[PDB]
Symmetry: D2
Subunit: 115 residues, 4 copies
């Protein structure tokens, strides 16, 4: 994976399972074009979003659908979603892990970027 | 003051000063329209974004211009900005504080909803 | 006020009220001795722990009694408490704010050192 | 591993490599007895601390030596260390991952607990 997403649940201390994730890439015109999407597994991880061929230089937005996740568990959370926006591969190809830690009124996000 | 933004710098252990903040309201066509903006003060806070009269129920996006903040300090950041998207409702009686804690490759955001 | 503690609840999106806080100073035999204590107020803050005169250079431990906080809300927490250990120095001119954001299986703490 | 520690660096967006970790277990008398120790690998992970036989019910403290980590990188951080204190295996045996995200004036810690 050049691009992986990992989500944890801070209330239960567990992976956040079945969290929808949509990724977009800023187009020529300056619009958010759909790029890839998927759902976290039982480990809270989403693999297979893209390949190193597809995953060119650009500005990407990883939208993590936190509100849906919390609602389905009986919690009415503050945020609509967690959005993570970043320039990727601008110094050549790299592997990105976008991690998110979710609470109903709070989240954190960290990127681990390696060669 | 129904809406307030407060940003901290986790690398220096200080308020994040002079950070640009842009707020958008979701329009009926699904577009984000400018709503309010400013720069955090010396205390890292941004007051007077809006009034009770103009802060109606709706979906808002608060964008914190983290990349510019880090670049002015000579530090290479990961994110384009941090975005906080939420629905404001029951109008009341409710003050919203969006807090953000910034690192170069990581941020958290929390909502403190009081009164 | 050279030392202040502020705690937020990430599950409710609110100040964490009535949280017990115990502070210890490291004694020359390597033991922690009681230094100051109190409970956070309605704003989630705890002021008047100490004075400039009694807050000398030294190693301090601030223990936030998170487990009791969660149990009074009917929620099963992971940690016994959150501990924040640091050296206070250059005496000045320096106000220390220890901030903490609490979830049942997770917390962050940040130091805001001003003046 | 019934007990694993994983540490990331929020400034560089990378695993925090070679971070010393010491674990203690509260004894009968009420003292912190040394239990296990080790250093994070290139992945930021510390495996092999203990076995399911050794890792009995008890109150454990995982001390993550953050100050040493930051100093060796030319940063003078706020905290002496990150301490994570919790009751383990009190409802039977479980697998614990203690994760930490480090910034010079800030850290978070999350526990992922599975069967
Ligand atoms: O983001 C925060 C994270 C922590 C845990 Cl490190 C503590 C405080 C924070 O920021 C705040 C934001 C708003 C208000 Cl009213 C109070 C606070 Cl303390
Ligand atoms: O970012 C994180 C920070 C902490 C400390 Cl509170 C705990 C979990 C995190 O999420 C990850 C971070 C890095 C990697 Cl490789 C995987 C994951 Cl699930």
């Amino acid at each position: 994976c050049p691009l992986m997403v990992k989500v944890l649940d801070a209330v239960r201390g567990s992976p956040a399972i079945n969290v929808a994730v949509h990724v977009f890439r800023k187009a020529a015109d300056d619009t958010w074009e759909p790029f890839a999407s998927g759902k976290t597994s039982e480990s809270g991880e989403l693999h297979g979003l893209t390949t190193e061929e597809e995953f060119v230089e650009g500005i990407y937005k990883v939208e993590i659908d936190t509100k849906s996740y919390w609602k389905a568990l009986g919690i009415s959370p503050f945020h609509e979603h967690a959005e993570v926006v970043f320039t990727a591969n601008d110094s050549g190809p790299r592997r990105y892990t976008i991690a998110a830690l979710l609470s109903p009124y709070s989240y954190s996000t960290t990127a681990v970027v390696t060669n």
